[PDB]
Amino acid sequence: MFAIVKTGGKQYRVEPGLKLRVEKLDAEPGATVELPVLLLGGEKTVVGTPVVEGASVVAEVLGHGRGKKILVSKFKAKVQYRRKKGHRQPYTELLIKEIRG
Amino acid sequence: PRAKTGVVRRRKHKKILKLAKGYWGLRSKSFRKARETLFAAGNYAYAHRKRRKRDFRRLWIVRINAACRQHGLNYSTFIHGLKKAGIEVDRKNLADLAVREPQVFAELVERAKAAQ
Amino acid sequence: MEAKAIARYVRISPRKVRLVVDLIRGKSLEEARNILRYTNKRGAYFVAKVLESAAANAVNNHDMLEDRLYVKAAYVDEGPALKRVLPRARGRADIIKKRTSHITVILGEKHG
Amino acid sequence: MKTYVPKQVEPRWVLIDAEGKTLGRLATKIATLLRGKHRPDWTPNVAMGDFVVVVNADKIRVTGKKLEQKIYTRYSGYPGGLKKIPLEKMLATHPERVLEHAVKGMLPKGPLGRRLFKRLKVYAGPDHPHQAQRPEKLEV
Amino acid sequence: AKHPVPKKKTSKARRDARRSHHALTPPTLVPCPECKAMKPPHTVCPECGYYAGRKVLEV
Amino acid sequence: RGEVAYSGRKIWPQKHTGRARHGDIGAPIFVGGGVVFGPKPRDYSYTLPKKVRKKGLAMAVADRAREGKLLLVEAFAGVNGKTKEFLAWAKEAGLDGSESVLLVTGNELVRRAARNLPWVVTLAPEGLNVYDIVRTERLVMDLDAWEVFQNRIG
RNA sequence: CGUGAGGGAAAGGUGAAAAGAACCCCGGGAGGGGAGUGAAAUAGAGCCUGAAACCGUGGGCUUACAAGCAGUCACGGCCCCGAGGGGUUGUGGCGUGCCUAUUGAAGCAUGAGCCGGCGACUCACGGUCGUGGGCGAGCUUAAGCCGUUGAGGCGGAGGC
RNA sequence: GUGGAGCCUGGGAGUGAGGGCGCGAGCGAUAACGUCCGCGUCCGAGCGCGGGAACAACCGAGACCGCCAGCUAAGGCCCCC
RNA sequence: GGAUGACCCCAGGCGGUAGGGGAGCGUUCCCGAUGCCGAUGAAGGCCGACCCGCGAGGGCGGCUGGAGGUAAGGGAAGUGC
Ligand SMILES: [Mg+2]
Ligand SMILES: [Mg+2]
Ligand SMILES: [Mg+2]
Ligand SMILES: [Mg+2]
Ligand SMILES: [Mg+2]
Ligand SMILES: [Mg+2]
Ligand SMILES: [Mg+2]
Ligand SMILES: [Mg+2]
Ligand SMILES: [Mg+2]
Ligand SMILES: [Mg+2]
Ligand SMILES: [Mg+2]
Ligand SMILES: [Mg+2]
Ligand SMILES: [Mg+2]
Ligand SMILES: [Mg+2]
Ligand SMILES: [Mg+2]
Ligand SMILES: [Mg+2]
Ligand SMILES: [Mg+2]
Ligand SMILES: [Mg+2]
Ligand SMILES: [Mg+2]
Ligand SMILES: [Mg+2]
Ligand SMILES: [Mg+2]
Ligand SMILES: [Mg+2]
Ligand SMILES: [Mg+2]
Ligand SMILES: [Mg+2]
Ligand SMILES: [Mg+2]
Ligand SMILES: [Mg+2]
Ligand SMILES: [Mg+2]
Ligand SMILES: [Mg+2]
Ligand SMILES: [Mg+2]
Ligand SMILES: [Mg+2]
Ligand SMILES: [Mg+2]
Ligand SMILES: [Mg+2]
Ligand SMILES: [Mg+2]
Ligand SMILES: [Mg+2]
Ligand SMILES: [Mg+2]
Ligand SMILES: [Mg+2]
Ligand SMILES: [Mg+2]
Ligand SMILES: [Mg+2]
Ligand SMILES: [Mg+2]
Ligand SMILES: [Mg+2]
Ligand SMILES: [Mg+2]
Ligand SMILES: [Mg+2]
Ligand SMILES: [Mg+2]
Ligand SMILES: [Mg+2]
Ligand SMILES: [Mg+2]
Ligand SMILES: [Mg+2]
Ligand SMILES: [Mg+2]
Ligand SMILES: [Mg+2]
Ligand SMILES: [Mg+2]
Ligand SMILES: [Mg+2]
Ligand SMILES: [Mg+2]
Ligand SMILES: [Mg+2]
Ligand SMILES: [Mg+2]
Ligand SMILES: [Mg+2]
Ligand SMILES: [Mg+2]
Ligand SMILES: [Mg+2]
Ligand SMILES: [Mg+2]
Ligand SMILES: [Mg+2]
Ligand SMILES: [Mg+2]
Ligand SMILES: [Mg+2]
Ligand SMILES: [Mg+2]
Ligand SMILES: [Mg+2]
Ligand SMILES: [Mg+2]
Ligand SMILES: [Mg+2]
Ligand SMILES: [Mg+2]
Ligand SMILES: [Mg+2]
Ligand SMILES: [Mg+2]
Ligand SMILES: [Mg+2]
Ligand SMILES: [Mg+2]
Ligand SMILES: [Mg+2]
Ligand SMILES: [Mg+2]
Ligand SMILES: [Mg+2]
Ligand SMILES: [Mg+2]
Ligand SMILES: [Mg+2]
Ligand SMILES: [Mg+2]
Ligand SMILES: [Mg+2]
Ligand SMILES: [Mg+2]
Ligand SMILES: [Mg+2]
Ligand SMILES: [Mg+2]
Ligand SMILES: [Mg+2]
Ligand SMILES: [Mg+2]
Ligand SMILES: [Mg+2]
Ligand SMILES: [Mg+2]
Ligand SMILES: [Mg+2]
Ligand SMILES: [Mg+2]
Ligand SMILES: [Mg+2]
Ligand SMILES: [Zn+2]
């Protein structure tokens, strides 16, 4: 089995055992959550419209993080406009436990 | 009291030249040409961050459009099938499903032709 | 074991000397001695002496066999410049740089 | 997750009959085959497409008055070196270049763009020497 | 004349590219059939003094 | 640039020298030339309102008075100008030497003794100032000094 | 430097102590290699620290069908440190230096070889706003005199 | 109509070389990347982004940052793309 | 919301030249300091993919270096190329 789930405005394919970083979910570390499923596939194959009724992917949140700092700088020539900005986009690391569905 | 430059300027130049390591000629070794280079780099990265979301979506489409025609419809006709079918699987996973799990992508084709 | 000799402040332009030092790098000692003897270059004299002083060190100081010697390394670093005045036309005075060099030869035992 | 990048493909060999098909309307497809845009795993930065073996490019056909009117141009670098060749004469002299010139200009410019042009191997007459690869005869 | 002048400072890369033809070719030497020493070919041996097989000059 | 030693000659002409334009070498743009807005001798003093320095003097004592670190002594018994005398006296007065003390008394001998103690500042009551008050964790005063303290803040 | 008046530089640092390297080896010497001193000798007198441009040696990656403000985004290969990183860059995408002056510059308009250090909105007195406090129909002292020797107090002339 | 609206008193400015485009006229030749006004606009300062092959001012649209998510605008959908 | 910056929530604004404003980093120096860090290594130099900060910066570790450095909190300028 695999599942296409949607969290943090994006869609990711998940499987039991997989680790991934999605947008920062409001949850306590070590807790578990149900991710809404848009498609199941593998043995069976079920198509969401857009989602599926009794479908949920269980994930345990291992912890939240701050990505590698990305420098975003803007420079406008001949106009003495310079800006330096440091960005660490937060994330949440999840372990996909089981695919109910 | 007198405050000469002392340690300040070189430390700020050592900050910039470190961020310019890998550049060609004086672009990596000269502070001034490292600045003019790191300006351009700082803008290109901000643009190509924006352009990256554009780049992959186009790559996803071309692959989606490729696996569609193996079934007899084009990209445009397929996407509208998914809209009328109500399937919000995005183009990242769509193209992913096209190469790896074509039997699922084949099913998604049926739902698109049947929504017609 | 390695041996080393340096000829510091050799009054000659390093760029001219490296041309000769390139000939002997990685070469066996006797070969280099033969090479340096007939290279038609002012620098061949100096390189030959630093080489002979390094080979002497190996034998005398560092328990290395003369027959087992080769030029493991050799490089010409530039020393201070002797800035001299060259009178040009129209009253202008240029400044000629008469250049020194630090010639290094490093020897090792090539076993065969 | 990240986009699947394919392990190096084993390219396919393709045989097209060019006889009586329109010049630009066959050229544009052969470019798509060369570019590999028919492959679900299409990667824009590697050589991926097929090897398009074309025959009977002498019998390619074109519309209008383009036999007398369309003029392929060559510049030498010397004064007055602007050579003009009507599609007419080029067919009589080097007929394989008509398809090549058309197909080339529809491929990207740059390193990968030229590597793919080396994969198009045009011939006149019904025969081709690449039977060693056994190209799948395509109806396009 | 109007005193031609270099437009831009030549790069380290470019000047070293020019000097890619500047390596000295080692002196070509052959052994002297009398004293075996390395001497230039077609020259009176400077170590023993032989050539053609016979003594020619003092050493 | 006018107080520097160099002369006022224009080193080379204005134009046609192929070199940037300059005047005397006393200009601050030259190494060894003058400095532009570097310091001159200044008088930093200014007349704070007496009623502020008066209120400050009283308030500073008040802060020590609140936290109990104010002690008015009747006199200093066995101290006659020797330091070790004052040491034993501080030991009777609950002044071990772990709190910085402002000693304020009109007696020269008592002042003479504590002078060289690292944890004691000495003062004649006319010299009572809030800085030395705030510096000191404790404050000791002859009742001579307390008397004239009231006089100044009257 | 200038006939002269006159102009007018640069240039400091071994170490606690010379203990400043006897003597041996290559060399004409210079220089070095050992031995020796020293906590330290990349503290050896061309001496504390020893940055940068600059030059060189060695190694990893890469480069001879390739079109470039030199980067950037993506992917792949290789090398290193050990679902992660760092170095390199083959391909694809995108991409008109910095400053200055301009209606407008990548601009074939100004300035800059490069690097290091020096280099430009200050102070005084008055003014006028705002602001932090003291006092309030009042507020405040100036020079000075006294005191301390980084102590403060006096001084009402005068000024608002 | 609660808007980086308006009004009153003050402190601090900078600007007082504009430019293109649409309309309205004038000068010009119902010439000029012409010149001079009126209304508006954009550049100026948005030479940040999409289109227009490329191109300050034409069309689209006012970039706080991140995402390998989605919808559209002008413009596009044979290949380059 | 809690009650006067504790943090939390909801919503909206955040292109920008001349220019006005606000909040901060860093440099020399004074107080704090008859203290404190310091030969088990000061400042400075060389690294770093590590930690913190929007940033300017701060740390932290390794190497060099071989005698100085200086906190919370304030003060003053020959203060950032
Ligand atoms: Mg559920
Ligand atoms: Mg630009
Ligand atoms: Mg501008
Ligand atoms: Mg500028
Ligand atoms: Mg300065
Ligand atoms: Mg460097
Ligand atoms: Mg859709
Ligand atoms: Mg020169
Ligand atoms: Mg292109
Ligand atoms: Mg002539
Ligand atoms: Mg000439
Ligand atoms: Mg080189
Ligand atoms: Mg060259
Ligand atoms: Mg003068
Ligand atoms: Mg005069
Ligand atoms: Mg001039
Ligand atoms: Mg010049
Ligand atoms: Mg001057
Ligand atoms: Mg001078
Ligand atoms: Mg001076
Ligand atoms: Mg004392
Ligand atoms: Mg004290
Ligand atoms: Mg006293
Ligand atoms: Mg003279
Ligand atoms: Mg004279
Ligand atoms: Mg000393
Ligand atoms: Mg000697
Ligand atoms: Mg010893
Ligand atoms: Mg030594
Ligand atoms: Mg030392
Ligand atoms: Mg020294
Ligand atoms: Mg010392
Ligand atoms: Mg060095
Ligand atoms: Mg160095
Ligand atoms: Mg190398
Ligand atoms: Mg070719
Ligand atoms: Mg090649
Ligand atoms: Mg190239
Ligand atoms: Mg890609
Ligand atoms: Mg890697
Ligand atoms: Mg390009
Ligand atoms: Mg101008
Ligand atoms: Mg102009
Ligand atoms: Mg002009
Ligand atoms: Mg140019
Ligand atoms: Mg000009
Ligand atoms: Mg220019
Ligand atoms: Mg001008
Ligand atoms: Mg010059
Ligand atoms: Mg500089
Ligand atoms: Mg001012
Ligand atoms: Mg004022
Ligand atoms: Mg005031
Ligand atoms: Mg008041
Ligand atoms: Mg009064
Ligand atoms: Mg005293
Ligand atoms: Mg307004
Ligand atoms: Mg007003
Ligand atoms: Mg106003
Ligand atoms: Mg005017
Ligand atoms: Mg006007
Ligand atoms: Mg206007
Ligand atoms: Mg119209
Ligand atoms: Mg005009
Ligand atoms: Mg007009
Ligand atoms: Mg302007
Ligand atoms: Mg624009
Ligand atoms: Mg442009
Ligand atoms: Mg465009
Ligand atoms: Mg906005
Ligand atoms: Mg917004
Ligand atoms: Mg759409
Ligand atoms: Mg297409
Ligand atoms: Mg919030
Ligand atoms: Mg917001
Ligand atoms: Mg802005
Ligand atoms: Mg605004
Ligand atoms: Mg200690
Ligand atoms: Mg200091
Ligand atoms: Mg740091
Ligand atoms: Mg250190
Ligand atoms: Mg000392
Ligand atoms: Mg410090
Ligand atoms: Mg301090
Ligand atoms: Mg502080
Ligand atoms: Mg200054
Ligand atoms: Zn012989």
Shortest CA distance to A55 belongs to which of A12, A98, A11?
A98
Contact C39 E29 (CB under 8 A): no
- E partners (3+ CB pairs within 8 A) are B, C
Structure tokens at F54: 């008066």
A9 interfaces chain B, CB cutoff of 8 Å: no
d(CA C80, CA C66): 34
d(CA C44, CA D116): 55
d(CA C70, CA C30): 8
- CA B1 to C1' I75 (Å) is 13
Structure tokens at A65: 């993080």
Three-point CA angle F118, F119, F120, nearest 5°:
95
3-state secondary structure of E52: coil
Return the HEC string of chain D: CCCCCCCCCCCCEEEEECCCCEHHHHHHHHHHHHHCCCCCCCCCCCCCCCEEEEECHHHCECCCCHHHHCEEEEECCCCCCEEEEEHHHHHHHCCHHHHHHHHHCCCCCCHHHHHHHCCCEECCCCCCCHHHCCCEEECC
* Residues contacting residue F122 through CB under 8 Å, at least 6 positions apart: F103, F111, F114, F115
B near D: at least 3 beta-carbon pairs less than 8 Å apart: yes
Can you state the angle between helices B31-69 and B75-85, rounded to 10 degrees? 80
Structure tokens at D34: 């060369």
Give the N- to C-terminal CA distance of chain D in Å, as an integer: 37
Residues linked to residue D138 through DSSP beta bridges, in sequence order: D16
Query: Do the beta carbons of residue F87 and residue F67 sit within 8 Å?
Result: no
d(CA D21, CA D96): 15
Q: How many domains is chain C built from?
A: 1
Centre of ligand 15 to C-alpha F24, Å, is 10
Which one-letter amino acid corresponds to residue A55? Answer: A
d(CA C54, CA C72): 11
Query: Do the beta carbons of residue C7 and residue C79 sit within 8 Å?
Result: no
For C22, the domain range is 2-110
Name the DSSP letter for residue F119. Answer: T
Q: What are φ and ψ of residue A95, in 5° steps?
A: -115, 120
Query: Is there contact between C33 and strand G, defined as CB under 7 Å from any strand atom?
Result: no
Q: Count the Cβ atoms, other than its own, within 10 Å of residue D102.
A: 20
The CATH number linked to C12 is: 3.90.470.10
d(CA B48, CA B60): 17
3-state secondary structure of B79: helix
Name the DSSP letter for residue C66. Answer: G
d(CA D29, CA D103): 9
Cα distances (Å, whole numbers) of residue D15 to D23, D25, D98: 16, 16, 18
Start-end of H helices in chain B: 8-18, 26-29, 31-69, 75-85, 91-99, 102-115
Contact C38 E22 (CB under 8 A): no
d(CA C21, CA C43): 8
Taking every pair of C-alpha atoms in chain F, what is the biggest distance, in angstroms?
A: 89
Q: Which residues are in the CB-under-5-Å shell of ion ligand 11?
A: E 3
B22 interfaces chain E, CB cutoff of 8 Å: no
Interior/surface letters B11-28, b for 16+ CB within 10 angstroms, e for the rest: eeeeeebebbeebeebbe
* Residues contacting residue C89 through CB under 8 Å, at least 6 positions apart: none
Return the HEC string of B80-93: HHHHHHCCCCCHHH
Three-point CA angle F5, F8, F10, nearest 5°:
130
Query: Do the beta carbons of residue E47 and residue E56 sit within 8 Å?
Result: no
Cα distances (Å, whole numbers) of residue E57 to A63, C28, E30, E44, F66: 93, 31, 19, 8, 116
| Beta-strand relationship, F120-123 and F101-104 | parallel
Name the DSSP letter for residue F7. Answer: -
Query: Do the beta carbons of residue C37 and residue C17 sit within 8 Å?
Result: no
Shortest CA distance to C52 belongs to which of C73, C72, C68, C30?
C30
d(CA D38, CA D29): 10
Cα distances (Å, whole numbers) of residue A17 to A1, A14, A35, A101, D83: 12, 9, 15, 17, 68
Q: What is the resolution of this structure in A?
A: 3.0
Query: Do the beta carbons of residue C75 and residue C50 sit within 8 Å?
Result: no
Query: Do the beta carbons of residue C20 and residue C43 sit within 8 Å?
Result: yes
The size of the B-E interface in CB pairs under 8 A is 3
Helix (H) or strand (E) holding A62: strand A56-66
Residues linked to residue C5 through DSSP beta bridges, in sequence order: C105
Q: What are φ and ψ of residue D12, in 5° steps?
A: -95, 150
d(CA F99, CA D93): 111
Query: Do the beta carbons of residue A87 and residue A10 sit within 8 Å?
Result: no
Note the residue count of chain B: 116
d(CA F88, CA F57): 30
Q: Suggest the residue from D12, D29, D41, D138 to mutate for an interface test with chain B (most B CBs closer than 10 A).
A: D41
* Chain G footprint bases within 7 A of protein beta carbons: 6-10, 25-34, 46, 51-58, 65-67, 69-76, 83, 85-95, 97-102, 105-107, 113-125, 133-135, 139-142, 147-148, 151-156
D1 interfaces chain A, CB cutoff of 8 Å: yes
Find the nucleotide nearest D2 (Cα to C1′).
H68
Centre of ligand 23 to C-alpha F97, Å, is 18
Long-range contacts of B25-28 (CB under 8 A, 24+ apart): B25/E11, B25/E12, B25/E13
Structure tokens at D66: 């383009």
- CA B5 to C1' G58 (Å) is 37
Which one-letter amino acid corresponds to residue D54? Answer: V
Find the nucleotide nearest A70 (Cα to C1′).
H66
Contact E26 C35 (CB under 8 A): yes
d(CA D126, CA D123): 8
Gyration radius (Cα) of chain D, Å: 17
Interior/surface letters F75-109, b for 16+ CB within 10 angstroms, e for the rest: ebeebeeeeebbeebbeeeebeeeebbbbbbebee
The partner residue sitting opposite A74, judged by closest CB among B38, B43, B88, is: B43
- D partners (3+ CB pairs within 8 A) are A, B
Query: Do the beta carbons of residue B112 and residue A47 sit within 8 Å?
Result: no
d(CA F29, CA F40): 20
* Residues contacting residue F130 through CB under 8 Å, at least 6 positions apart: F53, F56, F57, F59, F60
E-only strand ranges, chain F? 70-73, 101-104, 120-123, 138-142
d(CA D12, CA D50): 5
